Design an enzyme around this catalytic site. Sequence first.
Site, PDB file in Angstrom:
ATOM      1  N   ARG A 164       0.797  -1.221   0.000  1.00  0.00           N
ATOM      2  CA  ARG A 164       0.000   0.000   0.000  1.00  0.00           C
ATOM      3  C   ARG A 164       0.830   1.271   0.000  1.00  0.00           C
ATOM      4  NH1 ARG A 164      -3.680  -0.794   5.035  1.00  0.00           N
ATOM      5  NH2 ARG A 164      -1.636  -1.505   5.771  1.00  0.00           N
ATOM      6  N   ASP A 165       1.712   1.426   0.978  1.00  0.00           N
ATOM      7  CA  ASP A 165       2.581   2.578   1.204  1.00  0.00           C
ATOM      8  C   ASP A 165       3.777   2.593   0.232  1.00  0.00           C
ATOM      9  OD1 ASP A 165       0.768   3.043   3.380  1.00  0.00           O
ATOM     10  OD2 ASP A 165       2.087   2.079   4.834  1.00  0.00           O
ATOM     11  N   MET A 166       3.566   2.410  -1.067  1.00  0.00           N
ATOM     12  CA  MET A 166       4.670   2.240  -2.011  1.00  0.00           C
ATOM     13  C   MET A 166       5.098   3.599  -2.552  1.00  0.00           C
ATOM     14  SD  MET A 166       7.062   1.088  -3.692  1.00  0.00           S
ATOM     15  CE  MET A 166       7.082  -0.617  -3.114  1.00  0.00           C
ATOM     16  N   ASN A 205      10.441   5.078   0.133  1.00  0.00           N
ATOM     17  CA  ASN A 205      10.272   3.886   0.986  1.00  0.00           C
ATOM     18  C   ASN A 205      11.109   2.700   0.474  1.00  0.00           C
ATOM     19  OD1 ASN A 205       8.558   4.778   3.060  1.00  0.00           O
ATOM     20  ND2 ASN A 205       6.694   4.119   2.154  1.00  0.00           N
TER      21      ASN A 205
END
Lengths: 259, 159, 584, 88
Positions: B32-34, B38
């Site tokens: 999700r947090d791509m 990151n």
Amino acid sequence: VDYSVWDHIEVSDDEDETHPNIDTASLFRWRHQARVERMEQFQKEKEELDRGCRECKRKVAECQRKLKELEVAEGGKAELERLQAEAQQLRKEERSWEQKLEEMRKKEKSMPWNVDTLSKDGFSKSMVNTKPEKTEEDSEEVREQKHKTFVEKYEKQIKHFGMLRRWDDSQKYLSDNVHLVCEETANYLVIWCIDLEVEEKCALMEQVAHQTIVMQFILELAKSLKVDPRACFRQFFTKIKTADRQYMEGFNDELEAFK
Amino acid sequence: QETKFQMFQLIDIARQTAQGMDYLHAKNIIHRDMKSNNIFLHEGLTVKIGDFGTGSVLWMAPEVIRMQDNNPFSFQSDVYSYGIVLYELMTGELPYSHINNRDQIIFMVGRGYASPDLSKLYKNCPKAMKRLVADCVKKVKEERPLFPQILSSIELLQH
Amino acid sequence: LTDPSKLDSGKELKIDIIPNPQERTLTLVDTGIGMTKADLINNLGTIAKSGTKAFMEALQAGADISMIGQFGVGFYSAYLVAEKVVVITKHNDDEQYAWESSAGGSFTVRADHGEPIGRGTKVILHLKEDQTEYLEERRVKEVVKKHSQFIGYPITLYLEKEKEKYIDQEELNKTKPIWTRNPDDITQEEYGEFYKSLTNDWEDHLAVKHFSVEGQLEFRALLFIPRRAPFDLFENKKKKNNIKLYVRRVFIMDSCDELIPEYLNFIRGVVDSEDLPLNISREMLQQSKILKVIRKNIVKKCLELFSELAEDKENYKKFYEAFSKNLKLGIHEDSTNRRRLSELLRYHTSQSGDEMTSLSEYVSRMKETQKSIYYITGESKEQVANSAFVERVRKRGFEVVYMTEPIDEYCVQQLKEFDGKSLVSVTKEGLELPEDEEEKKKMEESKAKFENLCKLMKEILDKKVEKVTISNRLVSSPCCIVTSTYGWTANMERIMKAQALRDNSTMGYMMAKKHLEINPDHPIVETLRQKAEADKNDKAVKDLVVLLFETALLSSGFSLEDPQTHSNRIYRMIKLGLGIDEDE
Amino acid sequence: RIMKAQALRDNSTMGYMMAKKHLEINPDHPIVETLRQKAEADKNDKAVKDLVVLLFETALLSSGFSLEDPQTHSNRIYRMIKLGLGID
Ligand SMILES: Nc1ncnc2c1ncn2[C@@H]1O[C@H](COP(=O)(O)OP(=O)(O)OP(=O)(O)O)[C@@H](O)[C@H]1O
Ligand SMILES: [K+]
Ligand SMILES: [Mg+2]
């Protein structure tokens, strides 16, 4: 020997299941959170049916009570048909709710074990040892007392300790007689060998020279390292076995040179 | 820092990123947090993906920036974000970056009135990669490939 | 328990081991139930049949019995060392019989006529000539103490010389398994004697924790914190014995990275479970994830013990001085427990005495204007205490954490914050203390006043400095060298260069760039401004700036590139003062 | 300096392996013959005391020892620098 109950276990922070391109500390966070969410999401899906089925159970029961009231009474010629159609539709609903509940319990029986579902705490007791506190004693009496308590009981055991002069049996006495690893045991070999000097008993002076240099080695080592003599090891005897080994060739003269 | 990599090296990084992404999906983990901030490089250009890191909007899919449904996360959402990452690797320059208005991004991406500018891509970019970028950012989730396909394409593309 | 006449064939419950060097036999005897003729045929004659489980099935409603021998294959391990096995036995309801076999596809049963056995069984092994080891006094003791020391009947060993013509030593089973008792019944003397017996320590434990767990996975355990770090606790060449795992009180396994993390390896103890999926061999456990679930319950408990121990100031000092190296390694490696491990830390601080404080004690003393925790790293408390970097910080009365062992450079990388407050090094570029506008104005007057001196000092030192700038941290010194915000600090570089097996090809990447800070309020610095203004290219200014730079570099913790250049400058200045009239 | 730098320091064991420092004079060196003369000519001379200590701190650096506190050493330098410049 049926071990199948153990087959499905999930351990969030398992170190053996990792990939070189994912950061290990973040992989544990995602697997941890995921099992938590599943347990909440599945519990919501289960409780939704408990809410639902209670409603249909009460509706069918009450319309059946009313069916009993109306079927014996005026207007029953239609209100039997209505309250039976309610009893039956609500009973159909009850069966549907039960099917959803029994599918949910068969899904729960299909979920893996985890650290929350395997166990709960029993006993728990913590203790901290306050008892040992510093004490002093008059060493003149301690010396005489340790002679009575140990030396009179172990002087016959001098033959049990090392008699071969370059590697020795009973070397594990760093475990078996640890309480005797002290200066008083070294002083013992100087107090007690006086008859051997007087009687020229060279072979006993020579074999006990090996025990003497070992006592001087472990006590001097303990002094030199600021440690308890009891904290030495037979690895340390193996370390003085390396390279140039010993200086006891001069102590073969001490037995005469010390007179 | 705007440092530069050779095209082969840029592909090696994309490959490792996909290889990690596939492993997450196999384990049924939706990242999700791509974001490109990151993903981290280490010695030998080892790629480490994590949660360790505008960007509040930029890498998310058109349905997700819209909050079109209740956290509609899927593997394809991660694919979309991956495709965006490939785009920036293959330009050295953020998508849509002739524009920077917050509400215009929510409008034009959310309603399908702009792609990223694939005309900005490197001249040394394999045509297969240009397609891969385009494919990974296709507007409909049903239209974009999953990692096994992406990775297979990358290895074939690199050889 | 229910037919008390059963024991009238012999009252005592015991085990005897009787080697015979003269006849090359090892005998084992017990006063247990024994076997009928039908039981010899069925139970020793049938592979994979167990009399034990049949017995257990006949028990009802949770009898107080928990037996070991489930599988029905272990008896035949006798043939690992024996050429021939004889079992002599007598039940209460039968004659005495002999069973005999050499495992050649058949066995014999015979009615015995030798000396009577009151009840029970005698096993006789005729040993192979290259297995005579097990007749020796030393191996029998090692084997029984290694595998069977908690079995719960007296095991007696008999030998034809000791003076005695039969020593009968029960001491093979002397220690009781204390963890099976209710802990309310157990005093510190009992834990003490056990722990000496478990570990061969000559001194008591510092603290002990007794606990148990129930459900699908059931176990009891004892964990001990020793009063001293083992002399060789951290050696990487030694296999650890520290936790032993027992099932139904028999020893399974050892050497366990699975049961406890390496940062907790000083804890000694026992884990004993009633039921685990054991391998056919009994040497190992089938579902290895079980060990991981046992670990996750041990660690929580270990941390709780440390925490409770932190309420006894006296004992926590002894603990922490022996094992502080351990907890900081836990901050580095344990991404889950980092947050509790940090509350266990203590440090010397500048506002403290020679006594150590917690980070929550630093936080409770913070001024309302502090938004961070200040610290310094170095080679000793004295070296950091008189350090140039802490002069203005201590002048303004902030508290500073002193970190002075090499492992502190590792845990500070990972402990970014405590209680929401960030850690900030007084050694890095871009420190700030709380602002005061008057001071800000002075710094703006100062950076204007000194501007071109910084330009000249960045022309002279150009190879080996990133920038020259005014200090906001100096008092009572003319300068200091500080590192860039990313890459290694001055201390981290010292530690890295000494790692015997480390690959140093990456040093060009991880070393930080140097910043030089000047104190503008200082005499040497202001006279250097005047002389640099008088003529920019005076080689004497180039000489003075380089001498100041090396001195600062050294006092800031960085090695000099070649100390002989440095010493020679000193030997020339010594001559000048010492009154050498021969200038040559 | 390798042993002092190890992470798993076991520092209880550390004290016992410090070697004893010995100081060697170069008898040909002009600073130390001047010292040989000032030592005969006045024994109570504090100038010698300061010279001998500054030589010792400088000799430690040459040989690869660290200083027990690097500040005292730098202060001796900042004093010589101030005298050389004529600041005080
Ligand atoms: N001294 C004995 N007295 C009574 N029964 C015995 C004795 N020794 C062995 N047995 C019988 O022999 C059977 C087979 O034992 P064996 O050790 O081979 O397998 P097990 O005990 O059943 O299983 P396991 O391999 O786990 O020990 C036992 O179950 C028991 O009935
Ligand atoms: K059997
Ligand atoms: Mg058995």
